[PDB]
Design a protein that fits this description.
This is part of a larger assembly, with 2 copies of chain A (34 residues). With 34 residues, chain A is mostly loops. Chain A has no helix or strand. Bound molecules: 2-acetamido-2-deoxy-beta-D-glucopyranose (4 copies).
Chain lengths: 34, 34
Amino acid sequence: QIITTDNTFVSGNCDVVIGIVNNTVYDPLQPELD
Amino acid sequence: QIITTDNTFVSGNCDVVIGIVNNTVYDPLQPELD
Ligand SMILES: *[C@@H]1O[C@H](CO)[C@@H](O)[C@H](O)[C@H]1NC(C)=O
Ligand SMILES: *[C@@H]1O[C@H](CO)[C@@H](O)[C@H](O)[C@H]1NC(C)=O
Ligand SMILES: *[C@@H]1O[C@H](CO)[C@@H](O)[C@H](O)[C@H]1NC(C)=O
Ligand SMILES: *[C@@H]1O[C@H](CO)[C@@H](O)[C@H](O)[C@H]1NC(C)=O
């Protein structure tokens, strides 16, 4: 599945996790902000 | 963590639960209403 704000959760900034990768996390809400 | 509508679910009106407390529940939709 696509990485989204629904199938994931945040905790803290990117500095502490020993292996971490840059990728987009999609948000389904803001594409219809109006 | 901040008590949002994503951390929680609703059921009844407040009168039935013994020991319930009054507090705000945050909604992360509210800033996105452009
Ligand atoms: C994983 O292994 C490779 C090859 O030994 C190494 O270059 C890399 O730094 C390791 N990654 C982590 C997160 O330690
Ligand atoms: C990940 O993204 C941040 C912010 O652009 C950048 O500082 C960092 O160097 C990037 N790391 C890699 C491996 O792309
Ligand atoms: C908890 O105990 C105190 C002391 O007896 C009492 O005043 C209070 O009403 C009780 N709270 C609940 C939620 O029953
Ligand atoms: C809780 O909030 C309601 C609505 O403002 C109020 O009627 C009730 O008296 C409050 N109870 C307490 C214990 O603050």
